[PDB]
């Protein structure tokens, strides 16, 4: 059912994830992590400590596609043990901030075309698949972003609820 995903998106807040390539993400849905620039880093931090979930909601440039969404279980840490991040020609490792702890909630693709009945205040009422990477996704158009989501059947929400 979609009542306990109901449960953690209730007031949470929702961010846009843009990577240059596949394989961070895959990396992302392997290991339970992510890292972003510092400008978003000091946007998550502060989004974590302000509500009950924070989401992000992963898309691959150039794919036509969100490939899942997540939820923060930690502000970002340094010293763990290194992420080998493929980076786009200008980003560097040392750029990156420090690394988010994340529970994956679907991982499963959604297609642009399926959600292009949805605006995002935040942007211009632009359709919520155009943003910058880090761009914030009001409560409602985010809500029903995730709900459009095909059910991820290999997740159980119920130690999420739990973090909560
Ligand atoms: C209203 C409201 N409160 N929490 C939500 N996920 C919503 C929506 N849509
Ligand atoms: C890794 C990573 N963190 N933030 C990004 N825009 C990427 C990529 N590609
Ligand atoms: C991997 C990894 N590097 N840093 C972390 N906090 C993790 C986790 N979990």
């Not at 155009?130 to 997740?155: A, K």
């Amino acid at each position: 059912g979609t009542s306990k995903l109901k449960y953690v998106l209730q007031d949470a807040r929702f961010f846009l994830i843009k990577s240059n390539n596949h394989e961070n993400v895959s990396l992302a849905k392997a290991k339970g992590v992510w890292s972003t620039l510092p400008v978003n880093e000091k946007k998550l931090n502060l989004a974590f400590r302000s509500a009950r979930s924070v989401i992000l909601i992963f898309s691959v440039r150039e794919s036509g596609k969100f490939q899942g969404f997540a939820r923060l279980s930690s502000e970002s840490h340094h010293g763990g043990s290194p992420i080998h991040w493929v980076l786009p020609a200008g980003m560097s490792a040392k750029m990156l901030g420090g690394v988010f702890k994340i529970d994956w909630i679907c991982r499963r693709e959604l297609p642009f075309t399926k959600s292009a009945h949805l605006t995002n205040p935040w942007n211009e009422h632009k359709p919520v698949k155009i943003g910058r990477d880090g761009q914030e996704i009001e409560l409602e158009c985010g809500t029903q972003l995730c709900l459009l989501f095909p059910p991820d059947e290999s997740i159980d929400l119920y130690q999420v609820i739990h973090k909560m």
